[PDB]
Every structure is written in structure tokens, then in C-alpha cells.
Amino acid sequence: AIEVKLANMEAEINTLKSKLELTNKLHAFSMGKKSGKKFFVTNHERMPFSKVKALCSELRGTVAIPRNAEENKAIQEVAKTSAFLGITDEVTEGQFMYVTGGRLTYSNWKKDEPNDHGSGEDCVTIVDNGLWNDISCQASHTAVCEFPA
């Protein structure tokens, strides 16, 4: 009778775990997650970069960062407007790094990797046409978070 309940409750807990796993899978699917690929989500709210970082962190994802043409288009389609990307040149001007670390392996600048020569535009936004431009991290742009494949 003692271990009986513990057994029923343990199995009970397992069924809840299974239900939640499905809920998460279906949610991701509904959010447009492509099989075996990272996906992007937005609440369409515009805010300063620091807030975007905090929000994506709270959701256990990270600020969206395109690493190839496919992802650049995907983020573009989700944002629908100017949105911050997870890259900055806050530390070394003209040398953008992912917020999670490292030099860019892919980019889509309007021209070349931008050195602002002192004006302080250290964040990056992707515009309606998919191109990237440096901008002030204090400006308010659309928050787009990414989640793992």
C-alpha cells in the first residue's frame, strides 16, 4: 500500500511528462518550426536591444541570428519589419561578434561590415528587404527570438 501509491504517482508523473512533451512539439510545429531546423518567433513588439536579449533569455532561446541565406529569409518573413539580430560590435568596432560569441560566418550588409568611426551604432537590424545595417542598440526594433533545431 505504501509503495503502491508511490508507483501510481510516479507513473502518473510520467504521463504528465509525456503530455507536456507533445504540447511542446505541437506548439513548435504551429510556430512554424521546420523539421530538424532552428525556428524563429516574435510577439511583434519593438524594444531596445537590451530588452530583446532579456526577453529571449527568459524564454530560454536567444536573439535571432541568421547563419545562412535560408535563415536570413526565415527571420525576415517572421519579423515583417526591422528587427534586431543577435550580433554586435560593442566590444571591437567594425568587428561584429555573435552575442553568444565568435566572428561572423555569414552576413548580408547593405555594403561592407560597418565601422561607425565613433558614432556608436553597435547593434544590427535586418530590414524588410533582408539587408543588414548597424544601428543604435538604444533604438527600439522588433524582438525576434530563435530556438534550437
Residue 97 sits in the site that holds a second copy (CB under 8 A):
yes
Distance in angstroms (rounded) separating the CA atoms of residues 19 and 6: 20
Question: By CB under 8 A, is residue 51 in contact with a second copy?
Answer: no
Interior angle at CA 74, CA 41 and CA 27, nearest 5: 35
Supply the DSSP string of 57-110, one letter for each residue. Answer: HHTTSEE----SHHHHHHHHHHH-S-EE-SEE-SSSTT--EETTSSB-S---BS
123 binds Ho ion (CB under 5 A): no
Beta strands at 97-98 and 62-63: parallel, antiparallel or unpaired:
unpaired
Per-residue binder mask for a second copy (CB under 8 A), 7-46, x = binder: -------------x---x----------------------
Which residues are part of a known binding site for Ca(2+)? 89, 93, 113, 115-116, 121-122, 133-134
User: Hey, how many other C-beta atoms are within 10 angstroms of the C-beta on 105?
Assistant: 8
Tell me which of 40, 53, 61, 89 binds Ho ion, using CB under 5 A: 89
Question: 39-58: which residues touch Ho ion (CB under 5 A)?
Answer: none
| Size of residue set near a second copy by CB under 8 A | 20
Task: Name the site residues for a second copy (rule: CB under 8 A).
Answer: 20, 24, 57, 60-62, 91-95, 97, 100-102, 115, 117-118, 147-148
Interface with Ho ion (CB under 5 A): 89, 116, 122
